[PDB]
Structure 1
């Protein structure tokens, strides 16, 4: 069903995460963490304090798909265990030092071909597949994009709801 999902998405903020590689998205699915550059680190830290849920929607570059989406459960933190990201060319581990804890809501893929009818008012009404890392997605677009994903029966939204 979709009722607990819709409850989680009600009045959420949505952000596009564009991973350069698959390795870090698999790590993020395994460990429930994400790290971004400080400009997006600041944006997400602000959004986490402002909304009942902040949803990150992942897509790895060149894949033609989204790989799932997750909810921020914390602000970024520095000083923990060095998460072994595959660091992109031009990105240092000090830049990715901020670590967000995330709860996955769906780890299933969605091909871009299935989101062609959805455009983002905060990105000039471009198809929602188009955007740089950190691009905020408007409420209705983001909600409808999340509802397009195949349900992930492995995930129980009860624990997620217990953090809102």
Structure 2
């Protein structure tokens, strides 16, 4: 059911994550990590301290879809093992230096056409698919977006709930 999911999403904060390629989202799903540009890294570290849950909602650029969503389980940590990201043009491996641990809540896709009725107050009420990497999504919009995803029955939210 959706009861444990709703419990995880209670009073959460939501951020849109944009990836230039599928490879990095696949790597994030396999290894349970994400890295983003320094400006967004600061915002996520601030959010992680402030909310019961911080939810990253992933979308690969030009894919027309969201690829799933995950919960931060840590602040960014540097110096550690180097993740073999595929780097876009103008992206250096030092900009993606900070590494967040994440717990996936849903690894299923959602097409943008299915979220056309959801607008984001924190981005001028543009459709929620619209936003730069790191755009915050207001609570009610983010909650309804996450509830539109197909259920991912391979994930037990029981361990997720305990981290809180």
Match of 2:163, SS state, is coil
Match of 1:108, SS state, is coil
Quick one: distance in 1 between partners of 2:82 and 2:20?
Answer: 19
Residues paired across the two proteins, number: 164
Quick one: distance in 1 between partners of 2:78 and 2:34?
Answer: 12
Quick one: distance in 2 between partners of 1:27 and 1:134?
Answer: 19
Please report the TM-score for the alignment, with normalisation by the length of structure 1.
1.00
Report how far residue 92 of structure 1 moved.
Answer: 0.7
Q: Which position in structure 2 is the counterpart of 1:157?
A: 157
Q: What CA deviation, in whole Å up to 9, does each residue of 1:31-76 have, x standing for no partner? A: 0000000000000000000000000000000000000000000000
Report how far residue 88 of structure 1 moved.
Answer: 1.2
**1:1-164 alignment to 2 at 5 Å?**
1-164=1-164
Report how far residue 7 of structure 1 moved.
Answer: 0.2
Q: What CA deviation, in whole Å up to 9, does each residue of 1:81-133 have, x standing for no partner? A: 10000011111111001000000000000000000000000000000000000
Alpha-carbon RMSD across the aligned residues, in angstroms, is 0.3
Match of 1:162, SS state, is helix
Please report the TM-score for the alignment, with normalisation by the length of structure 2.
1.00
Q: Which runs of 4+ in 1 moved over 4 A?
A: none
**Structure 1 spans left out of the alignment, 5+ residues:** none
